[PDB]
Amino acid sequence: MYDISVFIGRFQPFHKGHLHNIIIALQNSKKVIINIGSCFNTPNIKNPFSFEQRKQMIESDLQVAGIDLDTVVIEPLADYFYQEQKWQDELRKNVYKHAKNNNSIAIVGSSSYYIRSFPEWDYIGVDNYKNFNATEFRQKFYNGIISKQYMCSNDPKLGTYNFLTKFMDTQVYQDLVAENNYVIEYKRLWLKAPFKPNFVTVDALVIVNDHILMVQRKAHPGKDLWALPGGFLECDETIAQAIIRELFEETNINLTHEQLAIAKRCEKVFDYPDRSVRGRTISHVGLFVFDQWPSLPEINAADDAKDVKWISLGSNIKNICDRMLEDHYQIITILLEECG
Amino acid sequence: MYDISVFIGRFQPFHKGHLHNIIIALQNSKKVIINIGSCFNTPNIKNPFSFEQRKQMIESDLQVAGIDLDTVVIEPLADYFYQEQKWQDELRKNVYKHAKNNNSIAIVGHIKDSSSYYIRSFPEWDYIGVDNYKNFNATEFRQKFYNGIISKQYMCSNDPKLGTYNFLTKFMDTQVYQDLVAENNYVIEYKRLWLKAPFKPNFVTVDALVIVNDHILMVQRKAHPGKDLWALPGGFLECDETIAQAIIRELFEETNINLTHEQLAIAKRCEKVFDYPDRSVRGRTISHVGLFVFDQWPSLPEINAADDAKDVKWISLGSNIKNICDRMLEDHYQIITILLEECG
Ligand SMILES: Nc1ncnc2c1ncn2[C@@H]1O[C@H](COP(=O)(O)O)[C@@H](O)[C@H]1O
Ligand SMILES: Nc1ncnc2c1ncn2[C@@H]1O[C@H](COP(=O)(O)O)[C@@H](O)[C@H]1O
Ligand SMILES: [Mn+2]
Ligand SMILES: [Mn+2]
Ligand SMILES: [Mn+2]
Ligand SMILES: [Mn+2]
Ligand SMILES: [Mn+2]
Ligand SMILES: [Mn+2]
Ligand SMILES: [Mn+2]
Ligand SMILES: [Mn+2]
Ligand SMILES: [Mn+2]
């Protein structure tokens, strides 16, 4: 009937619930565009696999009962938690790429967001079976258990099953297990709270001669990832004070607090509920700009930073965009745009 | 030696440590100007007494001491947690209401914490460092006071019939006292729940300042802290919502304002963060507010009190707002002032 079905998911991992929904869409349309959300990030516990691995996983799963691969296309989406129009444009870009000859288009499926966001397209609704829970799957996986009832295949050499089986031997699997054990122990310790906690953190975006100051993380979450210098707000300091305290603790930047105060452009809040794996963490980020300086200030890593670097804007920043903590690539992008 | 000395305190309440320091100020100057900090706020456990009450208390203790009251003047200072320049000027306005045409002026504060601040902000005035062994604990005194005990070693007067000591004896029979004790018990219990947590909490709240035809929407509080006070509508941020959503969710819950989500999204001017660490008695609470401006609107939307709001009212700017200025929750007066200047 439709020329095109639009299908959006995380696929962390791809399962039978996904295969049956694609199948409903392929008997309602001639071609499916599968849009994988949350790409171009480093692996974390909620997002273990890359775009390429998930794309592969999907293809080799579809290639087993049935399915014509000529009727299927796969495109990536980045996260834009604070700039939803960008996300919308990017999805529209992915679709216009495959449907620009007045093709008939429907979104197969956050059912209300897609209905509000995309009036141009029809919404094919799908209620599934027993709740295929991606968290439950992943938590058993970091415990050594692939749940074969989720798997498209039954053969451990076929599909996601084979990918998941082999993945358990990788270094990335270990890192993720380590991160997950950290978070379980961290979350446990906080069940004491009379009320579920919001964490308040601070970060500093410091630009000197078109370089951004970044820290490589010594500890979980995001161990060995690059990040803005920052950490927890303390009960006795203002946000503005915490921003500078963490900056100096982690990087020992050779600037005075007065200089940084003159260089300060703004402070923004980042409050996407799932930005961090510890629990709900709101970050206040200060932007500091030195259009020019005789040189890059001296920096020395300390505390939870195992390294610190001045990294130039443009290509060098883009090249570590998938080696950064949490939403820090978005934060950098936003603050330089609007503050700026 | 100096014509004027300048002395700043909260005096919640005035005590022997304060007296001690005013005696030094007067060995070094001919007139001392006493500035009472945190004036014009409603009574809270940390600030139980009004400006007038503290003034009375100081005058009566200085008679007991007995310092000639012609050598003493008393002026109020409001709080400006977020507008440090309004405070510096307001002080200067206090000092020069009294010092005139080439008086030598000294500030007499603690050589320890607030030494730095006064040196920098008031270079025109000299400094007289004070502080002596004693460790007079303001908090320690109020806690015992909320348990029914006036600590004698704090009292300038040994006689319960006189001075601050008398004032506090009589104050203990009032309803305000009873409301302070109740707030205190609430706060002690609130904090007890949190003693176990691996880290001290920073609490996150939201408020909405909604202005329709120069009227602020304000709730009157059902629960602690600041019971029976007027506040911007607001409350705790939940874990599964953004701050933008929280601000609107709490607005509806407390006021049932007859406006739509898109109508408020259009009316929204800005959000501001309020993070003075001692702004709330519960523990460290940061607030994100929430400015919404409706101009030349056909009518004031319909509202009704629910959840922790027991009343809700449209309050016109200007006269009716300064009227309840000392009847507001925590720093909401300051928050309203700031959001009107910088966003509206
Ligand atoms: N919820 C929390 N509140 C305050 N401090 C914390 C919290 N969780 C961890 N920390 C401390 O902060 C350290 C990490 O550095 P940073 O995140 O830069 O402040 C950890 O090693 C903890 O000791
Ligand atoms: N730390 C907290 N986090 C979330 N909700 C809370 C917290 N403390 C108190 N509350 C709830 O908020 C109520 C008061 O309403 P509100 O302050 O307007 O959200 C109390 O009755 C509590 O149920
Ligand atoms: Mn290994
Ligand atoms: Mn840190
Ligand atoms: Mn820290
Ligand atoms: Mn740190
Ligand atoms: Mn370089
Ligand atoms: Mn409330
Ligand atoms: Mn409420
Ligand atoms: Mn609430
Ligand atoms: Mn009116």
DSSP for B206-255, please give it. Answer: EEEEEEETTEEEEEEESSSSSTT-EE-SEEEPPTTS-HHHHHHHHHHHHH
Of B48, B37, B30, which is closest to residue B281 (Cα–Cα)?
A: B48
The whole-angstrom separation of Cα A289 and Cα B139 is 42
At B244, list the tokens: 């933008």
Q: Which amino acid appears at position B259 of this protein?
A: L
Contact A7, A32 (CB under 8 A): yes
Per the CB < 8 Å rule, is B284 touching A235?
yes
Angstrom distances, CA of residue A69 to CA of A32, A108, A162, B99: 10, 18, 20, 89
User: Topology of domain A1-192, per CATH?
Assistant: Rossmann fold (3.40.50)
The whole-angstrom separation of Cα B16 and Cα B30 is 21
User: Topology of domain B1-196, per CATH?
Assistant: Rossmann fold (3.40.50)
Q: Is A190 in the pocket of ligand 1 (CB under 6 A)?
A: no
Write phi, then psi, for B310 (nearest 5 degrees): -95, -20
User: Domain boundaries in chain B?
Assistant: 1-196, 197-344
Give the helix, strand, coil percentages of chain A, each rounded to 5. 35, 25, 40
The whole-angstrom separation of Cα A99 and Cα A94 is 9
Q: Before A340, cis peptide (omega within 30)?
A: yes
Helix axes A160-167, A51-62, angle to 10 degrees: 140
The whole-angstrom separation of Cα B238 and Cα B240 is 6
Q: Strand, helix or coil at A273? A: coil
User: Topology of domain A193-340, per CATH?
Assistant: Nucleoside Triphosphate Pyrophosphohydrolase (3.90.79)
- Say whether A232 counts as a known binding-site residue: yes
Q: How far is the CA of B154 from the centre of ligand 11 (A)?
A: 48
Provide the β-strand partners of residue A36: A9, A76
Residue the block writes with tokens 């400094």: B127
Contact A140, A7 (CB under 8 A): no
At A25, list the tokens: 């869409």
Q: Which of B198, B237, B288 sits opposite A190 (nearest CB)?
A: B198
Per the CB < 8 Å rule, is B236 touching A195?
yes
Angle (nearest 5°) at CA B241 between B240 and B245 = 165
Q: Among positive and negative, which fits the CA dihedral B39, B43, B44, B45?
A: positive
Q: Within 13 A of A125's CA, how many CA atoms are on the CB side?
A: 6
Residue A244 CA, distance from chain mean position = 27
The whole-angstrom separation of Cα B264 and Cα B247 is 11
Asked if the domains at B1-196 and B197-344 fall in one CATH topology, the answer is no
3-state secondary structure A25-63: HHCCEEEEEEEEEEECCCCCCCCCCCHHHHHHHHHHHHC
Return the residue of A nearest to B238 by Cα: A198
The whole-angstrom separation of Cα B329 and Cα B280 is 9
Residue B38 CA, distance from chain mean position = 5
How many angstroms is the resolution?
Answer: 2.3
At A166, list the tokens: 């082999």
Contact B321, B216 (CB under 8 A): yes
Q: Within 13 A of A215's CA, how many CA atoms are on the CB side?
A: 31
- Say whether A171 counts as a known binding-site residue: yes
The whole-angstrom separation of Cα A48 and Cα A151 is 17
The whole-angstrom separation of Cα B72 and Cα B59 is 9
Return the residue of A nearest to B237 by Cα: A198
Q: Within 13 A of A222's CA, how many CA atoms are on the CB side?
A: 22
Q: Which amino acid appears at position B168 of this protein?
A: L
**Helix or strand (DSSP H, E) at A84:** helix A84-96
Angstrom distances, CA of residue A335 to CA of A206, A231, A286, B143, B336: 11, 18, 9, 46, 27
Q: Which amino acid appears at position A63 of this protein?
A: Q
Residue the block writes with tokens 């370089």: A211
Contact A114, A125 (CB under 8 A): no
Give the helix, strand, coil percentages of chain B, each rounded to 5. 35, 25, 40
Helix axes A51-62, A16-26, angle to 10 degrees: 70
The whole-angstrom separation of Cα B297 and Cα B258 is 13
Write phi, then psi, for A246 (nearest 5 degrees): -70, -45
Q: Before A194, cis peptide (omega within 30)?
A: no
Q: Which of A192, A193, A282 sits opposite B204 (nearest CB)?
A: A282
Contact A32, A126 (CB under 8 A): no
The whole-angstrom separation of Cα B255 and Cα B328 is 17
Q: How far is the CA of A230 from the centre of ligand 4 (A)?
A: 4
The whole-angstrom separation of Cα A253 and Cα A259 is 11
Angstrom distances, CA of residue A121 to CA of A23, A27, A87, A91, A117: 19, 17, 16, 12, 9
Q: Which of A192, A267, A273 sits opposite B240 (nearest CB)?
A: A273
DSSP state string for A9-25: E--TT--HHHHHHHHHH
Burial of residue B332, with CB atoms counted within 10 A of its CB: 0-12 exposed, 13-18 middle, 19 or more buried: buried
Q: Which CATH architecture has domain B197-344?
A: Alpha-Beta Complex (3.90)
Return the residue of B nearest to A191 by Cα: B197
Q: Is A123 in the pocket of ligand 1 (CB under 6 A)?
A: no
The whole-angstrom separation of Cα A16 and Cα A14 is 7
Question: Which residue puts its alpha carbon closest to atom 12 of ligand 2?
Answer: B236
The whole-angstrom separation of Cα B40 and Cα B43 is 9
